[PDB]
Write a protein that binds this ligand. Structure first.
Ligand SMILES: CC(C(=O)SCCNC(=O)CCNC(=O)[C@H](O)C(C)(C)COP(=O)(O)OP(=O)(O)OC[C@H]1O[C@@H](n2cnc3c(N)ncnc32)[C@H](O)[C@@H]1OP(=O)(O)O)=[N+]([O-])[O-]
Ligand SMILES: CC(C(=O)SCCNC(=O)CCNC(=O)[C@H](O)C(C)(C)COP(=O)(O)OP(=O)(O)OC[C@H]1O[C@@H](n2cnc3c(N)ncnc32)[C@H](O)[C@@H]1OP(=O)(O)O)=[N+]([O-])[O-]
Ligand SMILES: [Cl-]
Ligand SMILES: [Cl-]
Ligand SMILES: [Co+2]
Ligand SMILES: [Co+2]
Lengths: 144, 144
């Protein structure tokens, strides 16, 4: 089951400048930063709250590592702004299979590595009323 | 202080069809529906989780009531997708004043009525790295 909003993926041209914007404006601090070379992003997670399923909700700020990437292409076409939304689950493999069986395009056969060792997959935005939709299971198992 | 992600505002051409998409695909049910004639929207709130500040996190699905509206104009230019993000606070008036004093454009002098009697304001997307940003205080006071 999808039991939380895990994060909002926000694309930006300059991660350091956008991180400072969120710190100066709202007081949000950096929980974690990492580079994902497969996905072509440098990212910062800003924790906003904990959630009733034992997880948490973040802003995921993303700058591209290369123009030929999902985020690099998107920023070139659309400018900075919301890129994707992510739902958390205790079993992304099972939820992804159930959604595949409804005829929504699941982009990966098997979940791939995401932030902080998470396992992630994506649903095609044209099958989700225009919203790129991520499904994620955290590496550290959650206690509701 | 901004203590939670309150909701993701998602624009759609057909609220009933998009509500059914989220129910059939993810099992998300309708928490509340209302029309806001000032804002020019018909909306459905889908509750995803509770949050550690005593509040909750929703998907806010929005169809326009008229073409000459924030959401009607946006859908005409961009198609269906994420329209805004909202942060919850126990005191939107104080947080909005503190943000005004940083030179970010606050669109309302005083918070206006939003969903379920909430009080809301918005920050201009061009001052927020492309993200239309809502600040909201729930009408029913929260117990962390
Ligand atoms: C590491 C991590 C992350 O979140 S990494 C995030 C970066 N990675 C990802 O986004 C991977 C998944 N996304 C993708 O594979 C691709 O971007 C997509 C879904 C396949 C689309 O790629 P395409 O090759 O088709 O690009 P393309 O520009 O051709 O676009 C195909 C259609 O999708 C629409 N589209 C593309 N990106 C979109 C987005 N982010 N949201 C909404 N619609 C989008 C686009 O406007 C076009 O619609 P249109 O034809 O009406 O104009 N984490 O741990 O959480
Ligand atoms: C009831 C409730 C709701 O959430 S009601 C949600 C609907 N209401 C609202 O969005 C009210 C606040 N928004 C607004 O007042 C206006 O839409 C905005 C902020 C002033 C923008 O209106 P404008 O009159 O300037 O429209 P305009 O298209 O001219 O756009 C001005 C600039 O803002 C950009 N923009 C407009 N809407 C945007 C959006 N949702 N996100 C990002 N950028 C946006 C737009 O692309 C343009 O950039 P560009 O010049 O680089 O192309 N609730 O309770 O939670
Ligand atoms: Cl890597
Ligand atoms: Cl009304
Ligand atoms: Co993500
Ligand atoms: Co809203």
């Amino acid at each position: 089951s999808l039991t939380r909003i895990d994060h909002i993926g926000i694309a930006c041209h300059d991660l350091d400048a956008t991180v400072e914007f969120y710190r100066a404006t709202y007081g949000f601090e950096v929980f974690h930063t990492e580079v994902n070379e497969e996905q072509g992003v440098r990212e910062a997670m800003l924790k906003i709250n904990d959630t009733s399923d034992g997880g948490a909700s973040y802003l995921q700020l993303l700058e591209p590592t290369r123009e030929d990437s999902a985020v690099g292409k998107w920023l070139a076409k659309n400018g900075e702004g919301v890129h994707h939304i992510a739902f958390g689950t205790a079993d992304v493999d099972a939820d992804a299979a159930d959604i595949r069986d409804k005829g929504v395009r699941v982009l990966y056969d098997e979940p791939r590595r995401g932030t902080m060792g998470s396992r992630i997959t994506f649903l095609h935005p044209k099958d989700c009323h225009g919203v790129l939709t991520e499904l994620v299971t955290s590496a550290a198992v959650e206690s509701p």
